[PDB]
Amino acid sequence: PVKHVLLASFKDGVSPEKIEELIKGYANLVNLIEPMKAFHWGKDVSIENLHQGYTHIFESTFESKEAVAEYIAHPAHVEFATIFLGSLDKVLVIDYKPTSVSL
Amino acid sequence: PVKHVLLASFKDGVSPEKIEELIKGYANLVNLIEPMKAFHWGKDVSIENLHQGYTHIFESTFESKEAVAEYIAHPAHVEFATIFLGSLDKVLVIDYKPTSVSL
Ligand SMILES: [Mg+2]
Ligand SMILES: [Mg+2]
Numbered sequence: 588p589v590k591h592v593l594l595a596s597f598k599d600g601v602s603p604e605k606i607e608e609l610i611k612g613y614a615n616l617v618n619l620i621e622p623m624k625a626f627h628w629g630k631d632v633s634i635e636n637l638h639q640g641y642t643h644i645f646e647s648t649f650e651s652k653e654a655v656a657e658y659i660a661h662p663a664h665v666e667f668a669t670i671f672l673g674s675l676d677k678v679l680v681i682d683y684k685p686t687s688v689s690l
Numbered sequence: 691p692v693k694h695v696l697l698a699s700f701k702d703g704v705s706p707e708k709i710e711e712l713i714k715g716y717a718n719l720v721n722l723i724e725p726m727k728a729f730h731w732g733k734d735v736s737i738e739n740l741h742q743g744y745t746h747i748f749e750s751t752f753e754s755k756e757a758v759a760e761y762i763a764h765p766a767h768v769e770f771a772t773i774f775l776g777s778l779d780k781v782l783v784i785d786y787k788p789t790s791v792s793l
Contacts, residue, residue, distance in 0.1 A: 611791055627788055632755065633784055634785065646788070679740065681744065685749070686698065686733075688731075
């Protein structure tokens, strides 16, 4: 499954309540967008001080590379991204297929 | 489960074969370190050009925050980290508990 990951920090002024609604708004793309299967997230609680300032991590689970492809090409995603991104000071995205060391 | 994530790029000169052995060396910390349960990884295949230069993503799965705690305090991890980190131009770490939007 193509795992779609976004790491970011919320701009100055963004309230805890806005972030709550923003995250619920992002997770709602599972419902609005067929190719996006599951959505998980979390705040960072590391201890190594190597987080580069990023505070959250969002993980979405697609079935194929083409799925992430369409998702980006979805009008609901294009609309919502404006709302969310406007709340960020920085965004880091990664797309990978969980590879394992096995036989 | 405390998900431990590392994102990074391999310094100039690092060969594809070194990265292969380096990744196998990292995954081997599951065996050497009791608290570290599973390990998955992947190269980045995003399309948004928002990867900030990072090329890989490593995911480790611990059961609790204290588990990641001990892992960092493990001599085998301290030793191996020197080998791996010496191969990186930059490292970004995040520790989170996959939170879901549900009842
Ligand atoms: Mg869906
Ligand atoms: Mg273990």
